Symmetry: D2
């Protein structure tokens, strides 16, 4: 309704969302139920495209889309993105409501994501900061004398944007924005769990002037998307999700440009130096925000001997003084988890930690099929490494607390997990901070703040199992664009006189 | 002998080359024969490492190598590379001889490759031109106010360098150089066809001071290398070879940083504008150099109506006035092809073209199991697209000639092949050149010269089936290094006063 | 009136414009008459500040202005500039009218300048493209081992913007924009001939939120401004004007950062290669626009033997088929010159050329105290160098035409003038274009178009007598900002382990 | 002798050094005595060029030099610089001896400067890191659609390098290096006090292949150099010296590119946070090195209440435990000052401080016409600002010590001097360091180390009275090079299809 006026179809009491096939909304494949984690009820259905529609869509994106995007000058592409931002902003309440219902996101966080999407589109002007190239004069080698080089970038063509469930709106808008601003066409494949915010974002872009044959939104479940990733007309794949699916995506994709944001959690380190009030506050937030369903959620806290006591005590208080339930009461702090399955995994991970010597300091109580209390588990350094909570990413509001003798042990334990997305360090001493900055094997280190990618104002991405490459204003150009070198030969042509 | 004094083992009349296991030369796996394309005779044997030695080597590279390379300051790494250059240069004749014998490379081209390897090492100082980073002040967004960002690069750790047969020495030295200069350890896996130049380059590096536990040279045949690519301790794979193996490599590798130089041939375009003498000369060279066993070899010539006649006539004359045989007579122009199998493919591709309306303008005659004349085949535009010589890369001295009505048809035929490595354009008119530069889908375009990557003074790499990412002085840092972002939070700390 | 509602004072029938003293509009110094070149009539008066008000203003800019600008975060500075753009745009007709009346600018050119000013402000977002810095790791020298460097930019403080008469509105808005976006305070000193557009731009900026104590507009005549340039609180001087005043400005200023755009005219070269229709069209425009009162006006045309005839013939036709008179009839092409004195100089320069063998091909007739026909004077190469029109910049619609044997003579004659602002080259051949690009000693070379700085989308500035440094989106940051290096010492601190 | 074999002329027992006139050594102007501060004895004479020789030299540099430098490809320029480094290095003892005798430099510091000069030349390869340019695509504005921009740098032509007495060798080699590597010709004008090291450096460069008509060395006393600075053939002036002469230089020069390193001293701040042992050590060194005749010498120490006592006590001990006398005994720590006049100024400045409430904590005793003890004077915050030692730069081994309540007072007192070259901050807390980094108005801030420009590995330069622009590896290109923009117009030419 409203923005999706003539798109959505009320059939049998439940709104039915079609796929956008690079020209027209539609689809003739199986219909799929979309549910809310708030009550496990079916709030909508999405129409998945058939084999033939996928083939036809890719064919349109490749033969026409690449050129519609590329032949639309940057000044107009920018106007399209800014208009889209206006359209989403005036529809703010409706975008937010869908996030709250479809993703189980607390009202204030749902509003924050819509505003992030708006800002991202509006700041596409800043993405131009990394547009340019270089001139390489040839007289620095006898072999290249009287020769000359120009290097610039070019859009790759068709970019596939695969998105996770925890940021259904922002991630799709972000990927669409950086792919399009440089002249690419885009196929969006949102999570089948909450594909609704993506449908709304795309329509807004189409209403804003986005070349109709240069974008596609396909409601394909999991491995149904493999046929898109594996296709030669898709020159790049921008994927945000779990380490496991990412691995499958590259193996199916083969050679192409990839940006793989594979999350995992983040460790946070507290030096005897830290303002514990700031630290406790930021760490508590990092642990529970959106019920820990954030790639940059704090999963492990490492604090030096002299502050471990106070720090862990303060965080525990803050976590237990939270409010669970329905995401609507702006008084509530934590909503549900995307699936009861996710809560099961969390409970099993807490028992594991307890069996291995871990002790719950806050939470630990399941409240429903999709509800749980934010949990903080204390654990001795000599036993934490074998705990599931440490070796894996348990996507939920749960973190471990470990007392350490010094920075070297903190760094060592922080690097001991298989991931390397971000890390946080609270403290004041420049030398210890510099050491941690050099040795933490992660894409980004947050000094005196909890990790927060925001809209990518600062580039972010993983190391180790957390993936490869970065997203960020200006930086994402590297994943959806290729270099083009032009070498000019003026040997013996009289341009230079021996030089 | 000499440089390989105590390494090589004369066993049963044939020198036996061991693998370098990141600490000691050795190996206890199968021994493999290395032959010369000049006479199909066995000139040496290489010892391949066993499963256990591969495992132990990777373990050394990962646990110690990363740190030996990284903890050696750049100033010393540079001294190591410059010393290696001195060592290879004083052993020039011996490095060249091995190239001529093992690769079938003509004396002057073998000398050129050794000199390229020397220059590459010596110019590692220029690779530093892309060392730096940026400062991202946070006051351009209300959300990032009193915040601040630092972005820099870091070596990934262990880089796997897989190399082709056509540049056994330069490619290994190039990959080792750019991986090491930034602080990485490296596993080199050369072609099992001519692994000898690599063994000599590595020893020279080791004699020059290259951290002994930071490099490895494994004589593994084809799929034996898969276990290296698939290992999690290998953070990046730099591969130069065929499209097919590259595809297999990524599928085995999964998520990691990749530089894939997958070759294919290059098209060359001649406008009615061109100096035909320069064009004929450069195109003839591009067609026959090293018996067309160059990724940047000219495989297709497209010339406008008014110059097609003269141009094709001049190139034919130049190709037929060449001399085949043994690579030793500096009077000789073309040596043998790496295998008789490669010549078979070439002959079958020439008949195919003839059957589809193609006509031989020069060459076409096989001279031996590994010898053939450089061939130039004329073909009508309306039938060339289905010819094997057009649809595939026939690694041999053979190119098609096609008359075109204008630039648009030239561009269209040039883009019609599945590859996109380089393209050449001879002509003078700025407008037509700019159009071709924009529309040719290739990593690099050479204006008025045949395509030649040289030592990578200008970055190069593919598009389409030719691969992804670039190699070049300064640019290769992108494939063997990862970004690291440091975000500092000074909110409410009094650094700024509302700004 | 309107925008200047409570600022302007109707006194004795003529509007009186006060100076803005960094806080309040006012002034108690002599009043000065502002006239129109259209009828030599007094259209307004401006109040110049007294010695004391200049001193107090500088004191405010220095003690408070630097901090109001600097402590306003970039996000707000940008909002201020965008609001100012909205305000000027809705007042478009009024800004234009004042330009037509006060500057003698033809209606369509007056509208174009207001729109340029609007775009400049609106695109301040693009100026951020050159914001960043670099990280300089210290391990590339033994002396700097365990050391590290950060380099960034900082606003200088108080920037003095001195502007010419030919672009009274755009130049002030441009200088104010680039100085303010980086955090500087600004003192604007417009030409006393047409200071009205500047007063209107400043008020619009103040209405938009520009820190009131961070900007100043002083109506000081010529050498009265010297006291601003010579003051130590002025850290930078951005000057656009004649070579002579620029020289005086630096000598008075002493050591400080300078951007000196000193104009002079531009030469245009036509190769036998050129599309003469495009060339004739563009060159005619370059000669007459705004009655040649443009720093980038074409003052000399050099065409090779074979096209000289047609080219000069076409330009002559176009120049004589123009319409002079009052700048209001959108049917009119050329308005008056700023002063009768300027027309006198032009007539004397035409006779000089004639006396030295020059022949008028178009125009030559004076129409009034401030009116003249666009003139094109033919001249033999062997005598042109001593003609006033060649050795000087005669700010008027007048250019020389000279036939040349080849490119080398064209380049030589083009470089023979004492200026080096821009040069234009029409032709197609890449080699001849590259040669001209290398040898023309000018800040900017326009290929196949007349020179036009526009809003500085491409940086521009002089060489030789045309000055030093550049203005342009992103580039002007170099003149109003200084570098700041931070070197960190971690020697023996355990950050690095010998590296 | 040796290197200066056939150049120097033994006349009347004292070696006579001629000027190098861009082609031949010689000169026919007045001869001038060069003395040693070690014994006030005449150690040599230099021949100054006559009016005519200055005119002829400039004429050679302009008409031929610019082209000899520019037309020598970068690869050869680099070889020239590296050869020069070899030549100076093998003549190390002789270069050092002359520094010790002519400049009064302690043996170990004289050796350090020769080695700095050698490294500078040898690392000219790193200056290439800032060679490149940018491509500015035109589709981000409707006005620039189908347009395109290339920006690169070009040498200016003839650069004048004026050098101070405190680094007679390094400063000349540094300026010559960065001016020449980019293709400029250079006129060197060394201090008339110690012009000998410059003569030796130039000869070495000439022996190494430096284009003979592209360099000049003129022994002109003070204002005799004005005729070089004021000449239009000199496109840039690189000046290192006092604020006063710098001011005179620009006023004489008028419009041109300038790099003005005007020194002044540096303040050092010690937070209650600092390792006082490191601080005391570094600050003592910063105060006395080369008898404080360093632009980056510490002139003021500001330490917070709790460490002021220990810190000042430690520095005093270190300063008084030094050894004065003759610069030869490697056991000696401090040699003489360049002139007795310089010592007079120092003594008068110490009494002034004492009269205004200052108290000597170390030194204060004059030992001879050119000898003095390193002095440390304590002073109350409420009276220091009016002391000569604070308001001026007393080029000598003398600094003030002031106790401060906190960082804000330290920052305020540090910014209270009229200079702004460098500042040092010792401490650990990131927040206080960041605040000081933002608010100290200086070109460079050294964290936990004394200020040391070294060879310019990190760019350096002044703010306020300390001058404008920077010198440093890579950065100096900005002062001796100008931008060149090439704008290509393809409007309606079919390159782009509406974009
Ligand atoms: N900012 C930096 O990076 C830096 C580095 C090192 C030194 N410095 C500063 O520079 C000064 C160095 O000592 P210095 O005593 O030799 O100072 P200086 O007198 O100012 O040195 C001036 C240089 O300019 C020449 N000169 C003097 N008058 C001139 C004129 N009217 N026109 C053209 N050139 C003229 C001098 O030649 P004569 O010798 O013939 O008079 C000398 O070579 C100190 O204040 C120091 O702090 C700054
Ligand atoms: Na694939
Ligand atoms: Na893998
Ligand atoms: Na001054
Ligand atoms: Na001058």
């Amino acid at each position: 309704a409203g923005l999706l006026e003539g798109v959505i179809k009320e059939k049998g009491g439940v709104p039915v969302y079609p796929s956008y096939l690079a020209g027209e909304w539609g689809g003739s494949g199986q219909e799929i139920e979309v549910k809310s984690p708030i009550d496990l009820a079916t709030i909508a259905k999405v129409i998945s495209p058939s084999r033939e529609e996928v083939e036809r869509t890719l064919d349109v994106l490749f033969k026409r889309g690449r050129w519609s995007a590329r032949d639309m000058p940057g000044t107009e592409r920018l106007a399209v993105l800014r208009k889209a931002a206006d359209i989403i902003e005036r529809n703010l309440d409706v975008f937010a409501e869908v996030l709250v219902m479809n993703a189980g996101k607390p009202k204030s966080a749902a509003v924050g994501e819509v505003k992030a999407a708006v800002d991202r589109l509006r700041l596409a002007e800043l993405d131009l900061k990394k547009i340019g190239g270089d001139y390489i004069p040839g007289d620095w080698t006898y072999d290249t004398l009287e020769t000359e080089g120009l290097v610039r970038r070019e859009p790759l063509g068709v970019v596939a944007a695969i998105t996770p469930f925890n940021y259904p709106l922002f991630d799709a808008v972000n990927k669409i924005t950086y792919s399009f601003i440089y002249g690419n066409a885009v196929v969006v494949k949102p999570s089948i769990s909450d594909p609704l915010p993506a449908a709304m974002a795309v329509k807004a872009l189409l209403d804003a002037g986005f070349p109709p044959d240069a974008i596609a939104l396909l409601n394909l479940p999991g491995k149904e998307a493999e046929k898109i990733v594996a296709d030669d007309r898709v020159a790049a794949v921008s994927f945000t999700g779990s380490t496991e699916v990412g691995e499958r995506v590259v193996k199916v994709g083969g050679v192409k440009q990839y940006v793989m944001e594979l999350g995992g959690g983040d460790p946070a380190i507290v030096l005897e130096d830290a303002d514990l009030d700031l630290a406790a506050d930021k760490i508590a937030r990092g642990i529970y925000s959106y019920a820990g369903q954030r790639c940059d959620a704090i999963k492990l806290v490492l604090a030096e001997r002299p502050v471990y006591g106070k720090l862990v005590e303060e965080v525990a208080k803050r976590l237990s003084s939270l409010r669970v339930g329905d995401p609507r009461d702006p008084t509530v702090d934590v909503g549900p988890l995307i699936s009861p399955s996710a809560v099961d995994e969390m409970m099993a991970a807490i028992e594991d930690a307890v069996e291995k010597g871990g002790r719950v300091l806050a939470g630990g109580r399941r409240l429903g099929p999709t509800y749980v209390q934010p949990t903080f588990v204390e654990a001795p350094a000599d036993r934490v490494k074998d705990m599931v909570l440490y070796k894996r990413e348990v996507f939920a509001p749960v973190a471990l607390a470990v007392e350490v003798k010094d920075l070297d042990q903190a760094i060592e334990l922080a690097n001991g997990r298989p991931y390397g997305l971000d890390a946080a360090v609270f403290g004041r001493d420049v030398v210890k901070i510099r050491r941690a900055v050099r040795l933490l094997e992660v894409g980004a280190i947050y000094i005196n703040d909890m990790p927060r990618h925001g809209i990518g104002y600062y580039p972010f991405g993983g190391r180790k199992k957390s993936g490869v490459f970065r997203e960020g204003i200006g930086y994402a150009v590297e994943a959806v664009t290729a270099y083009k070198t032009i070498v000019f030969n003026y040997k013996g042509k009289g341009v230079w006189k021996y030089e």
